Structure formats: C-alpha cells, structure tokens
C-alpha cells in the first residue's frame, strides 16, 4: 500500500468499503476481506464502528459474497463475543437463505459459535435480558439445525450431522478416557459447568445433549437414509466414543443394528461404500483405550466384515 | 470445482486425468498414495521403482540410460516427458494440505488410503470433502479413457444446481451408463 504509513486506519477502511462499492463482480470480497482484516485484527476497536457498512453486504446476490458476511459475523464474534447481541439476528436469517450452499456455511459457523455463545454465558459476571434473549435466540438455532436432519437436501442433512455431533460433544462431560483433538483443548464441556450457576442449568444441558444423541441414533436407522449421511452419521458417533467415551456403549450398540439392518434403498455401491465405513469406523474405536470394555463384540463385527485377525491384532492397544 | 485426482504412482491414471481436466478449464491437482513410485519395467515382475523426491526429468534420463528403445517403444518416455511439461515431480497425497470439493481415486486401494489419510486427520471446519472411486486400470489406453469419463463425470457435476444433493443420482447413472462402480464417500476437513 503506497503511502499506507500515514493513512489512519479508520481512512483505509473508508477508502476500501467506497472501492468494493464499485466493484460489480465476486473480487470484491478481497477488498472486503482487507477491511475484515484492519477492524478485527489490526485495530478491533474500529470493529464495532464499521459493523453496519459489513453486515450490509448480507444483500449481495453473489453466493460468495454472502457466504464471506458469515464468516464474517464468525470472526467478529470470535473476536468480541458481545457482538453477537447484534449479530445472532443476520446470522439466522443466513440460516434460512435460499441458497443452499449459503445455509450450509452457517451451519459450520454455528458448529464454531454454539460453543463460544455458551463459554460467554458460563463466564458471565452478571446476565443482561438482552443477553439472556440472546441466548435463547442461540439455543433455539441449535434447535433449528437439529431439524435439519429431516430436510430433503442431502448436503444439508450431512451439515446438521456434523453440527448435532458437535453438540452432543459440548454438552456432555470429558473424562479420564477422553481423546480431545487439539484444536479443541479449551472448548467448553458440561464439567466445565458450574452446577450452581445462576443461568445456565448443567442438568438441563445434560439431557439435550442426551437427546441430539438420541436424535442422531433415531435418524441413523431411517429406512431412507442416505449412503452419504449414513456414512456422515457413523463417523461422528466414531468422533463421539472417543471424545465421549461414556457413550461407547450406545454407538457400539449402533454399529451392531446398522450391521444387522443395512438400509435397504441403498444401491449396490453405496453399500459396499457403506461397509467399508463401517469397517473403518470399527478399527478407529478398537484402537480407543475405552474398548477394552466392548472389544469381543468389536472383534465380532469385524470378523464378519470380512476384517483379517492380522488386521484386528494391528489396530488393538 | 476444485479436483484432486489420485493414482498409485503420480504418474500414469491421474496424470492423464490431470492433463485432459487441466486443458478443460478445471482446477485439478493430482497426486499419488502409494510408498514409492513405479514405472513399467522390461518384465511385469521387473517394475522400475523410486523415490517420490524424484524428479520426471530424472526419471526420463535414467530410463533413456538404461533402455532408450524398450522405453520409446513402451510409451514410458513420451508419458515421462508429457508429466514435466505439467509439473516437475510426482506428488505424495499424504504429503499435502490442500482443498479440495471432489478428489477422484484411480482403484479401491488407493480410495482406501485416501480416506484413511483424511480420517486420521483432525477435523477444524468440518467443510466436506467428496471421494468417488473408478476402477481404472494402470496402462495408457485405460488411462486415457478413464481420464475421459472423470473428465465427463467432472462436467456433469458442475452442470449441476447443487452437487451434494445431485452426485449420487449422477453417479448411479454413470454406474448404469459405464457398467463400472462408483464408490462414495465424505471426508472432512
């Protein structure tokens, strides 16, 4: 940037939000992703300032565009949680756009935020109504994107899995035996729960994280499930038995009924594509030091999906 | 669409499948699962084997050292020399960090090692990425006509609205169309 030593910040993102202005076309977003740049990272007390002039751009009828506001709103919200008083709004409204491939970027920004908006709320000093509806307005998108599940769009049933299973993980306790990917060493999980808090009831977060897990169970079963969400659906409960080693039994339990009800709309392929997940699935929790408790079952599954004992042994402690 | 097409060796199956999706427009990159690279030797229990860290061009000038006339006569050299003119080595999957909307796999083993690479790596974004197997046999005539039908496959896929709600109904076509499997699968970033 040819003098950009003595532009103000503030100057810049003028100059830069008056230049995407005028471009008619997807290369708008680098500029836009320069000012996104200079009032998160460079300078976040411009962020609250140049809000509106962003979020704006949520009209824009490029699919792109509309997909960077939502990331947009995700590193706004990463940066200054209290943003999402103002921003849970637009948020859901990009849930519910009639771009598929724009709702499915929101649903990979709530799998991120969910857990930030809950962390905020356990953490608080003290809980404005505001903050308090926000919450509500959170808790109630989950609640949309578990319904998801039963949309007749196959890529957006694949994203509400990946969200259910990162709920089902946020609200349910680590343990001794947890594998916690190391991204994911600072999210919050129930245990992290004051059981006392003024707010946030620990024992009502239990039971809804119990009932994703059952919803998840329920779907995974449904005679037209998809080879993709069925796929989908196996890989997180393999996510899950290692994360949340307390619900090993319910996913082995899962893995048995698949095996011994392979949906039955499946094509030749899909099903082959099917076995050879659950297969793989298998061998990622035997390798688990909580299947000790579950191994002879494991091993059966395996076996009769044609696993060799060489491999089995390979995939054991 | 951002492709990845995948063989054994990085040479023969995804370089052909590399070329023909590259000259077509596509974003394509192209890599290789196996533990070394092959080459056809002057005996089918004789492959030529080396290091991925080799470069075609050294490939090319050790192979014209050993047997000028039975790697001319055996196509070896010209896909050699076809391979630089794209990029200057073969590339290990395992080895990369990339991208991808779609990665297309050249056999079931290499499907397989695919999805093992990916599944072993933590998720982040959770962004899908689509795996699609064909059975494509290691030698040039198979090789052109398999690049020819993911070539094909690759259009269909971009000529449609949404790719994940429509590529199993295109790919089951295509199974009935080709006579050959598809195998499906998602990955996640």
């Known amino acids: 940037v040819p003098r950009g030593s003595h532009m103000t910040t503030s100057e810049r993102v003028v100059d830069l939000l008056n230049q995407a202005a005028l471009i008619t076309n997807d290369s708008k977003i680098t500029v836009l992703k320069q000012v996104q740049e200079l009032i998160i990272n460079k300078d976040p007390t411009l962020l609250d300032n140049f809000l509106d002039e962003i979020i704006a751009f949520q009209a824009d009828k490029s699919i792109e565009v509309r997909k960077f506001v939502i990331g947009f709103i995700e590193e706004a919200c990463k940066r200054d949680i209290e943003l999402l008083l103002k921003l849970i709004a637009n948020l859901n409204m990009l849930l519910r756009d009639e771009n598929v491939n724009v709702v499915k970027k929101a649903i990979l920004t709530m799998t991120q935020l969910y857990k930030v908006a809950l962390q905020w709320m356990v953490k608080s000093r003290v809980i404005s109504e505001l903050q308090e509806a926000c919450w509500d307005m959170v808790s ?42 190391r991204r994911q060493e600072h999210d919050i999980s129930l245990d992290r729960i004051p059981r006392d808090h003024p707010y946030i009831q620990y024992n009502v977060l239990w039971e809804e994280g119990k009932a994703a897990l059952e919803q998840l169970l329920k779907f995974m079963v449904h005679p037209a499930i998809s080879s993709i969400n069925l796929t989908t659906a196996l890989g997180s409960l393999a996510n899950i038995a290692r994360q949340r080693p ?72 | 669409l951002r492709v990845a097409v995948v063989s054994s060796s990085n040479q023969n199956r995804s370089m052909e499948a590399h070329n023909i999706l590259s000259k077509r427009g596509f974003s394509v990159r192209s890599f290789g699962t196996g533990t070394h690279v092959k080459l056809p030797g002057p005996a089918p229990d004789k492959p030529n084997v080396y290091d991925f860290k080799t470069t075609y061009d050294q490939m090319y000038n050790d192979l014209l050292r050993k047997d000028k006339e039975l790697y001319t006569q055996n196509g070896i050299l010209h896909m050699l020399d076809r391979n630089k003119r794209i990029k200057p080595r073969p590339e290990r999957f395992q080895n990369c960090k990339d991208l991808f909307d779609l990665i297309l796999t050249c056999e079931e083993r290499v499907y397989d090692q695919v999805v093992e690479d990916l599944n072993s790596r933590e998720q982040e974004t959770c962004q899908p990425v689509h795996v699609v197997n064909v059975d494509i046999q290691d030698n040039h005539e198979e090789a052109t006509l398999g690049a ?20 199993d109904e295109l790919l089951q076509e295509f199974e009935e169309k080709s006579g050959r499997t598809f195998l499906h699968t998602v990955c996640f970033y």
Do not use: W
Request: aromatic share 4%; with cysteine.
């Open chain 1, 140 to 181: 109630a998108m989950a609640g949309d994107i578990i319904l998801l599940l039963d949309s007749d769009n196959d890529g957006i049933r694949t994203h509400a899995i990946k969200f259910v299973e990162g709920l089902i993980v946020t609200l349910s306790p680590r343990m001794a035996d947890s594998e916690i990917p």
């Open chain 1, 246 to 317: 307390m619900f090993m039994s319910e996913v082995i339990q899962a893995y048995e009924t698949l095996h011994a009800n392979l949906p039955p709309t499946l094509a030749k392929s899909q099903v082959s594509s099917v076995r050879k997940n659950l297969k793989l699935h298998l061998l990622s929790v035997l390798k688990h030091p909580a299947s000790l408790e579950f191994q002879a079952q494991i091993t059966t599954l395996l076996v009769d999906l044609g696993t060799p004992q060489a491999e089995i042994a390979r995939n054991m402690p």
């Open chain 2, 148 to 167: 020819f039908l993911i070539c094909e496959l690759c259009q269909c896929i971009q000529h449609t609205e949404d790719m994940e709600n429509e590529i």
